Each structure stands twice: as structure tokens, then as C-alpha cells.
Symmetry: D2
Subunit: 312 residues, 4 copies
């Protein structure tokens, strides 16, 4: 497998670079940054090589700038983490506009070079996935974002720590926006494979507070250590593992909707099977009326931003 | 296994925390920092939990300050990365004196709490291992530093990339000081288990350039990306994997010499077996005339610092 | 960890020996057989060692007869696969009686040597677990059998292959007897973490035929290949993995009931958490009315055999 | 990766099928046998599926007879373990003739269907590799046998157990015939990367006895348990892991010589790099006078048999 990472000079991109280089199937990794940051990438490469010597793994790493995009051609996957730091004097809309310009430029250049799969991490992840889709002119299954996957994993942590179980014993799914209008699917939450509603202690779960913790966790980590790096990198690792061996894992990822669930012209976190050819939306799942109404509200929340940045 | 990490607020300590929390046998992790950095640790913990949800692993993580050292009792291992940033005007001896005070204080406090193993990463690593040994009053096999292990892994990288082979195909051992007096053991360098001196292409290896590259790599990464992160953490992971399952791996780690090789009252990188009870020096290995001379010189170099910081 | 395997001369026992010797935490493995088969075990040991050389793993393997039980003392776990072939003229009760003698003899000898955990594979597995419990006099959480775990995994396979999903995507739980009275828990079946009943395609699943397949799979593999070996060995590996790192995985294993679900004096497959100290029955799960009724019937069926062998 | 196994109904082929199906990169496995043994393969398939459910792995397994060779087309690799048991009345030449007919027939049928790599396990492994190469008309880098690799691994075990070290700490290389004329490369024997001749304890190594044990291990395992299973399967696994991720591991495998080391028209165990495109002989290695004389003798020994079976 061949993976390029645009934004490897940041903390998230660097953690992703390290984790993916360590995967046995990742034979070639391409780190891409602005010209001024090339040296950072050169440091990262060396660091990662040292790390591989310790983990008994191997990889060949190339470095290029974000204009020529050399070595990008032929990539099975391009992960984009490039994004501006949102200053306190900015709105969600300001961040959306600026990062939309960045993501659209990169998507157009990538589409000019080759056909590949785009994995968007830049926030607002749903809106940036939408921008990447429209500007790349790729097939919609080839463009997806981390979206609510991270949220699901954080929710998992909460559940696992409240019930005092191994974190991997918990599975959960969150659909909709990677934001305050996210819709956790309690019906799709389980421990040891058993639905969480089948537990008598389920009544003791402070679900409302837990969901608020999930919605706030990104801001919390920003305030405490300056932002997440390992969490999102490992979520990306999980998705990439599904892609590399064509596992078709049922996850929640942001992708473009062309009629599914009665919605169109919007990117949102939905149930998807992730495999070598990208993302297939799973419509075979049945939602409760409450969950579907919250999902509708979330999609309509995303669409305002998408409309605002579509043609930038 | 229970591991405490004093200095997890730094980049090396953070990466070590992430990697070790991911190990299935590390069930308890204690992150320790100065009081003002507690919030950083609180971010790290959350981040790591998120990452574990992505890697299908699990851990219980606690946070404490570097004065109370709460939760440290019971640790099978204590890794110390705490250290002062070396300013441009500081010599190695100035750094040694400052960090020797820090390391000795931590060692005294830990020895007051319990008996455990100490894994010193703070530089100059040989001298800090010495200080930890003498201040802790622990058994010598219980006190060791990364030493020349990281140098050996970096040498592995250089060789593998020169000959174009998988990094894990190369094995090499470097003994002596983690510094300019390090002694590469070409007699114990191999590719595919084959001594490197049995390859006709060995004559083509620019050995002097490669060794200089290894000696200067820390500074190079400092200048390129701000300092090493993943390399050191993965080297620590390799050592800890040998410890957890009592593999008695033959590595080069810094530890106190009490007669081996005709030296005493010094810490230096030597071939050791790494197991659940610590490091055991391997004196059964035979060095070339030249390699033993170089190792003697390096030992003297290290002792000149150890004598200056012993009683601080 | 230290594991003894009584019955390693058979195919299931040999596969279990190979898989467990490869686990990094399994540092000592004791192979035990009747005297006449000691040579077989010797061969097995050599074979396994060669295999470890290929897998880059390690283990120390000892051999001993089933009378001295040398090297067994100190074992964290003892797995028993010794059993007689069921001939066409044998009733299920005839098999239970003949194998109860074997299991009870071994259990009494083991309890005379030391206290340990007993993992019973010999069929009829529920009845043999009961016999092991009464003859060892061990605490009930220390004695368990594979029970409906294998059936569970087989059910998983069926579902996955019908829906064309990765096998690890499916989770299911089967309780009751390891036999025709087993009770599949559709309320605890899921694909990608989503309850299977929330898929619109669930109506297409031929559940009755699949359950008959699971019930008959043992005999089918007997008729095709001469008996299962890899399936049960891997199921045992899954259980041991939960034990070794105290994961408390929620599985279905057979263990003695002392009041749970309104039953006592019987061993049956039930939800359990699997840890370093054995199995803890989980009563916090709520089955459907029909499922609990069928579970009651199955426990009665099992108890009828347990009463016949309690005094044998 | 797609792998076919001709001979999966035997014990070595069944163990290989289990191990390879468990590998994440092996998405499709084809089991091939004589028509009469097809049911056995069906059994094997079900068994392996059950095992995958326990290991959290996945695979698509197909079954076919050895005449139509259905599903074989498109295989990246075809492993041949088909061979008749050596009865006490047959000499090595008799066995070679019979198995040469089997191997040549299979090689021609495979080449008739598609181009692929052939991995020969059938004994005499060097002679059967020679026969497969000549009858398939494939490029020589695409045809290789396990050869002395297994021997090397067995030697590893011996060395490790003598020095009381973890098995993975030892590396060794044996070249020449998979038989009594094998040539151990003591220079290429190491512990922790340290050449074995640089240990003072090397004087105590009963080297000749260990070599005789290695030469006789196959017969010993046959006499004790009826033949090797897991050892050869794991050796195959190691090679296949090199192939699948193009690691180009430096191993000793049997392959056709066309001038390397001064020999031609023979298959023998030689140092090779094993990758996605097959084996590349490493002529860069230099042997001592004694090593080369032993290797030349072994080559002549093999050539006799090869000439006897070339036209069968
Ligand atoms: N989906 C999710 O759950 C998550 C989303 N994110 C998002 O990912 C992005 C990256 O986060 P993080 O790695 O922590 O951020 P950093 O600030 O550490 O890194 C930012 C990256 O973006 C690049 N960049 C910044 N401005 C520009 C620009 N104008 N043009 C091109 N490249 C630019 C930087 O390059 P340079 O070095 O030259 O400045 C660097 O590669 C953010 O938008 C963040 O919100 C992060 C975490 C989780
Ligand atoms: N042995 C080897 O091969 C290697 C050695 N190292 C050494 O590891 C150490 C850590 O490096 P790195 O993580 O990059 O450094 P960082 O600056 O990123 O982190 C330094 C750490 O030390 C703490 N610290 C700083 N000043 C003091 C002080 N006065 N008393 C106590 N603790 C203090 C910091 O706490 P706070 O956040 O509160 O400031 C933080 O936890 C250094 O000594 C470095 O040279 C690194 C790599 C390889
Ligand atoms: N729980 C489950 O889902 C499964 C249960 N099983 C059960 O596991 C057991 C082993 O199966 P399998 O490995 O295929 O059987 P094998 O016939 O291959 O091996 C039988 C084992 O039992 C020993 N044994 C046989 N007779 C006696 C006796 N009279 N006294 C003592 N030991 C004896 C054999 O020793 P020796 O070599 O000396 O004959 C050998 O170790 C059976 O009871 C089987 O039904 C198996 C698979 C699945
Ligand atoms: N290179 C090495 O280091 C090693 C080599 N080997 C070799 O591997 C081979 C297999 O050994 P093992 O698995 O233990 O043997 P088994 O007897 O267990 O299996 C034999 C296999 O060969 C098939 N077979 C036998 N006779 C014929 C025939 N006339 N035509 C076609 N297929 C036939 C069998 O098919 P069926 O079921 O229809 O009879 C079955 O698939 C042997 O040649 C053995 O010497 C083994 C171990 C190590
Ligand atoms: K890699
Ligand atoms: K852990
Ligand atoms: K082991
Ligand atoms: K597979």
C-alpha cells in the first residue's frame, strides 16, 4: 500500500505518519508540507526510521512540497490533515471558509495528478469532506472523512470506564455531524457483543453527561495539552487497517449522500462498509424515529455550511 | 505490569506513555509531572484512551505530581525522561550537573517509596544512570539507562538504507558512551544473520560517515523538527518488551560496572541480558584488540563526568 | 504463565499446545500423556520448537506421564482434552460415564498436587466440567469448560458467510448445553456492533437451518475430516488470552451454578467474565422470555446427566 | 494475496492452510487434493473457519480437485506438499522417482493454467524443486523449495537451548542439501547479533553432535509422532510473510543455479532474498575454503539424483 499525508508537519499528521509507517502493508509513505516546512518533514522521517528500528518494522519514506506533490502519483490513499489554527477571533464559518480554500486547492491538484482515495481529517470534517468531494470530481465512494468515527471511539471509552470493562469490549456508533448535533445510537451500543439495553445496570448510566463529555472532549484536550494527536491518529489507523486488507468494516464515516436516508448534496457521518475501493453507505440499518429526527436535524445543520463553502 | 513515567509531559515521555499503554501487559500506567504540567498529563491520558479505543487495546492511567509521587508505589518499572532543555551556552557537564540534581532527587524519593526498576532516559544518559544508581541505593541490576541502544538502532537504519534492505534485517551493537566516544562493534554487525564482513560489498560501506551521522543524529533532529520523539519511545518499547516476558534479550544498555571488563564505579553501555529482574552484564563476549582499547577510552571519558556529579 | 495440557497426544491437545506455546506470555508448557504415548509428546515438543523458530517465539516445554504428573505443580492453568472415542454403540451417557472416570481421576490427582484453574475440553463438556469440579474440590470459579463458546464461534461463521461480512465483524452468544438444547441469543447477536434484528435483511436469514448446522457441525467435521482440531484449539486460545492479561472478556463458558438464574448443582454454558482468577457468572444480562425458557429446559437436560455421573 | 495448496489433505498441508488463512494479507486460499480426498478438504475448510472465528481473522477458502485445478488461476503462490510416504522398502532414489512424477505432473498442469510462484515442500526437496523448475518452464526465480531453511531453524533451536536463550535470539544459516551433506555456516551463527565464535562458551558447544541431531530430526519426529507438522508449516509461514510484504528477507532456500558460486544445472539451498517476485540468489556472500568444499560436495550429491529423475 502507498499512502501520502498532506499535513504531516502537524501533530496529527506526524502521529499518523508514525503509526502508518509501522504497518507491515504500508510499503511507501509520502510526507507533504508547505515548502517552509520541508525540513520538519525531514526530521520526522528520520525520527520514524529510528522508531522502526525499535519496532522491527520497515518503510520507505519520501518527502515533497505541496505544490509539485512529487511521489503522490500512484498513492492508494491520500490523508489530508492540513488546517489553519482557529484563533479566538474566528467563527466556525471563518474556519470553514479558510480550510475550504485549502482543501479545495489540494483536491483539485490531486485530481489533476491521479485518481485515488481521499481521507479528510481537517475540520469541520464534514464540510471539508464535502469540499474535497466536489472539487476533486472523484466518485463519492472514494472521498470520506474521519467524521463521527473519533466520536464513537471516545464514546466507547466513556462507556468502558463507567462499567469498568476492557475498552475493546465496547462498541458504539455515532452518526451525523462531528459536532454538537451528533446523534449517538444507543441501539447500536454493546458490551461483549450484548446490547447495552440488555443490561439491568443500564439505568445507572449517566448517558446525557457522557454524551456532553464526548461533544466537549476535543475542546477539553485543546485546553489541557494543546490538541489531540494520538487519538485521531489511531482512529485513522483503524480505518486504514480496514482499507488495506479489504475488511469492509462497518464504521461511521463522513461521506457524500446522493439519496440515502432521503438526503442529498451533503456529507455526513453515516454507517459505511470500508474496503479497498472506499466507502459503501449501509442503508440496511433501521433507526428509531427519535434517532432519525436527530439525524435529519444534524444533516440540515451541516448543509448550511456546505452551501456557504461549496463554490469557494 | 505497572509502569510510572516521570516526565510524561515532554515529547519523549508522552510518546512512551502512548506506546506502553498500548502494550497488552501494561495494565497500569502512572504519568508524573511537575504541578504546573498536571493539566498537560490530564490531556495526554484522555488522548491515549482515545487512541486505545482505535487500537483495540486497554489500560488504566493515573496522574500525579512529582512531589507526592502518588500511585507510584507498586510500579514494576519507573521510566524517567525529565530533564532541563540544554541551552546553546551549556556544556555537557553543566547539563550533567543540573540533570544530576533532578535525577538524584527523583531516585531518593522513589527509594523512599518502594523497591523497583529505574529506566533512565535523561541525558547525559550514562551519568544520569550513575546518579540514579548511587542515590537510589537500589541493586545495580535494577538501574539502567537507554545508553547506546538508541545509537545501535540508528546505526541499523543507516546500514539498512545504504544496502537497501529491510531495517529488521540488520543487527548491530554499540558499546561505551552515548556520545562521541561510542564504539561500534563491526565484529557484531550482521545482515540476515550474516556477518557484514562476509559481504564483498562491505568495502563500499562509508563507515566513518555513517558513524558520524549516528553521533550527530540527535542534534540533526533537534534542528529539523525540534527533537526526537518516536525513535526514543520505540527503543524504550523494545527494552520493555524484553522485560515484560523475561526474554533476556541481548541489548546494549547503560548500567553500573563493578569489575566487568576491568572497570568499576562507572555506568556505560554494555552488552546485557534484559529480563524481569533487570540487566545482567554479559562478560562472555570477546572484543577485538581495537574495540577493547576504544571501550577503555570511552569508560574513562564517562568517569570524568560521574566523578563531578556523584555527590551533588 | 504456566500451562499443563493433559491429552496433548491427541489432535486437539496438540493444536492447543502449538498455539499456546506461541503466545509470548506462555513461558512454560507441560505436556502430559499416558506412559505409552510419551514418545508422541516428545515428538510433539520437537515439532513445536521448530515451529517457534519460524514464528520468532519461545517457550520451555516439559514432558511427563499422567501418573507422576511431574512439572504440573505451579501451573496457572491445566487444560484437559483426554477422552475416549464415542463408538456407534455408545449412548451419550456411556460416553459421559467413561470420560467421567478419566476426568475425575485427573482432577483428584491435580487437586492433590496443587490448586490451579481447570479448563475442560473433553465431551460431554458440561458434564465433564461438573465432574472435574466435584472431584477437584476447587472453588467453582476455578473450574470451567469450553462449553457453548465453540458453538458461539461456529454461529458467528454462519452469520458472517451468509451476509458476506468479515468473520470478526459478527458477535453472538449461545448459552445452555453444548448440545442439541443450546439456546442461541438473537438478542445478543450483532454485526459491526449493530444488533442483527435492526437490519432490514435479518428477515432473509435462514436461522433454523443455521442453528441445525451449528448443532451438527461437530459430527459433520468427524464425517469429513475425522474430527475438529484447529477450531477448538483457537477457541481455547481466545479464552486463554482473556485469562493471561485479566481482560474479563464476556464469553459463554460452562461453569458450576450455585443459584444463578434460579439453578444450582449443574454446569452449563453461561455468560461469564474471564480473568486471571477464572470465570465470574454474569447475571446482569436479560434474555428474551423464549430464550430463558429454553435455557431452563437445557439446564434440566444437563442436570439429568450430571446426576447420573455425580457418583461415578 | 492468493495462495493455493496442493496437498492440503496431508498433515503439513493442513497446518500450512490453517496458518496462512490466519494471515491478514491472505484473502483467498485454495485447497487442492485428489478427488477422493475432497471431503477431507471440506472438513479442513470448516475447521479453519471455526479457528478464524477464535483468532478474529478472516479468509475466503475454496476447494478443488487436482485435475481441474479450479480456483487456482490468479494465485500469487502455489505450495506443493503432495508426496507418497516412504515405506521401509524404498530407497531415497525410489521416493525421488515417484514424487518426481507427482511434482512434474503438477508443475506442467499449473504452468498450463497460469504463471505463478511454486513453493516446493515435497521431498527430496532439492530434487523436487529441480523437477518443478524444469517441467513448469517458469523463470528460475519463481521456483523454490523449503530446502535447508527448516534445517537452519532446527539448528537455531539447538543452539538456543544449549545456551539457554530465547529462540528468536539465535540466527543461523545452512546451505546445500536438505540432507546429510548440508553445510552449516558457523560464521553465520549468532546470538543477539553476536557471532557465536566471539563467545568464550563457544568452546563448550557440542557442535558436531548438534549437527548430527539436526540431520536426523526428520527421522526422529517420524519415529516419535509419525512426522513433522507445525515446524515445516511455520517455516513456510515465515517465507510467505517475506513474500507477501516484499521484505526480501535473506534466507536459505532451494532454487536453480545458473552459474552462481560456479555451479549450474542443480537446485540447492543457497542464500537468497525472498520477495514478491521470488528468490534472488545472494552471490555477494563469501565462504571459507572449508565451507566451499563442503558445499561443492553437497552440490554433486544432489546432481546425481537430479540427473536420475530429470526425464521422468
Ligand atoms: N477529524 C477530527 O476528529 C480531528 C480533526 N483535526 C483537524 O486537523 C487539522 C490539523 O490539526 P493538527 O495536526 O493538530 O494541527 P497543527 O497546527 O499541529 O498542524 C496544522 C497542519 O496544517 C498545515 N497548515 C496550516 N496552515 C496551512 C495553510 N494555510 N496552508 C497549508 N497548510 C497549512 C501545517 O503546515 P505548517 O507546518 O507549514 O504550518 C500543518 O501541516 C486541524 O484543522 C484540526 O482541527 C484534528 C484532530 C482531530
Ligand atoms: N537516552 C537517549 O537516547 C535520549 C535521551 N533523551 C533525553 O530525554 C529527556 C527528555 O527529552 P524531551 O522529552 O525531548 O524533552 P521536553 O523538553 O519535551 O520534556 C522535558 C521533560 O522534563 C520536564 N522538566 C523540565 N525541566 C524540569 C526540571 N527542572 N525538573 C524536572 N522536570 C523538568 C518537563 O516537564 P515540564 O513540562 O513541566 O517542563 C518534561 O516532562 C532529555 O534529557 C533528553 O536529552 C531524549 C531522547 C533520547
Ligand atoms: N468442547 C468441544 O467443543 C470439543 C470437545 N472435544 C473433545 O476433546 C477430546 C479430545 O478430542 P480429540 O483430540 O479429537 O481426540 P483424540 O482421539 O485425537 O485424542 C484423545 C486424547 O485422549 C487420550 N485418551 C484416549 N483414551 C484415553 C483413556 N482411556 N484414558 C486416558 N486418556 C485417554 C489420548 O491419549 P492416547 O494418545 O494415549 O490415546 C489423547 O490424548 C474428546 O473428548 C472430544 O470429544 C474435541 C473437540 C471439540
Ligand atoms: N522440506 C521439508 O523440510 C519437509 C518435507 N516434507 C514433505 O512434505 C510431503 C508431505 O508430508 P506430510 O504432509 O507429512 O504427508 P501426509 O502423508 O500426511 O500427506 C500426503 C499428502 O500427499 C498426497 N499424496 C500422496 N500420495 C499422492 C499421490 N500419489 N498423488 C497425489 N497426491 C498424493 C496426499 O493426498 P491423499 O490424502 O489423497 O493421500 C496428501 O495431500 C512429503 O513429501 C514430505 O516428505 C514434510 C515435512 C518437511
Ligand atoms: K511499513
Ligand atoms: K495496555
Ligand atoms: K510462549
Ligand atoms: K486471511
Amino acid at each position: 500500500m502507498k499512502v501520502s499525508i498532506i499535513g504531516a508537519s502537524g501533530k496529527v499528521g506526524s502521529a499518523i505518519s508514525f503509526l502508518l509507517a509501522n504497518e507491515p502493508y504500508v510499503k511507501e509513505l509520502v510526507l507533504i508540507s508547505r515548502e517552509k516546512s520541508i525540513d520538519k518533514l525531514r526530521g520526522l522521517r528520520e525520527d520514524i526510521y529510528d522508531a522502526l528500528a525499535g519496532t522491527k518494522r520497515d518503510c520507505e519514506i519520501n518527502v515533497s512540497d505541496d505544490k509539485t506533490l512529487k511521489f503522490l502519483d500512484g498513492s492508494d490513499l491520500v490523508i489530508i490533515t492540513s488546517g489553519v489554527p482557529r484563533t479566538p477571533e474566528m467563527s466556525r464559518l471563518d474556519l470553514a471558509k479558510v480550510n475550504a480554500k485549502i482543501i479545495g486547492n489540494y483536491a483539485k491538484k490531486i485530481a489533476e495528478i491521479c485518481e485515488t482515495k481521499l481521507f479528510i481529517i481537517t475540520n469541520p470534517v464534514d464540510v471539508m469532506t464535502y469540499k474535497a468531494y466536489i472539487d476533486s470530481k472523484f466518485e463519492r465512494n472514494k472521498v470520506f472523512g474521519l467524521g463521527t468515527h473519533l466520536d464513537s471511539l471516545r464514546f466507547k471509552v466513556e462507556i468502558a470506564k463507567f462499567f469498568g470493562v476492557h475498552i475493546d469490549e465496547v462498541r458504539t456508533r455515532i452518526i451525523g455531524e462531528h459536532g454538537d448535533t451528533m446523534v449517538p445510537l444507543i441501539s447500536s451500543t454493546s458490551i461483549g457483543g450484548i446490547p447495552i439495553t440488555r443490561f439491568k445496570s443500564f439505568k445507572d448510566l449517566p448517558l446525557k453527561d457522557i454524551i456532553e463529555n464526548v461533544k466537549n472532549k476535543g475542546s477539553k484536550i485543546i485546553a489541557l495539552k494543546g490538541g489531540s494527536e494520538f487519538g485521531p491518529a489511531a482512529a485513522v489507523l483503524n480505518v486504514v487497517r480496514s482499507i488495506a486488507n479489504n475488511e469492509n468494516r462497518l464504521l461511521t464515516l463522513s461521506t457524500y449522500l446522493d439519496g440515502e436516508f432521503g438526503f442529498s448534496d451533503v456529507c455526513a457521518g453515516v454507517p459505511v462498509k470500508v474496503g479497498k475501493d472506499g466507502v459503501e453507505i449501509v442503508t440496511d440499518i433501521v433507526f428509531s424515529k427519535e434517532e432519525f429526527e436527530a439525524f435529519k436535524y444534524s444533516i440540515e445543520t451541516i448543509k448550511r455550511y456546505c452551501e456557504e463553502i461549496k463554490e469557494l
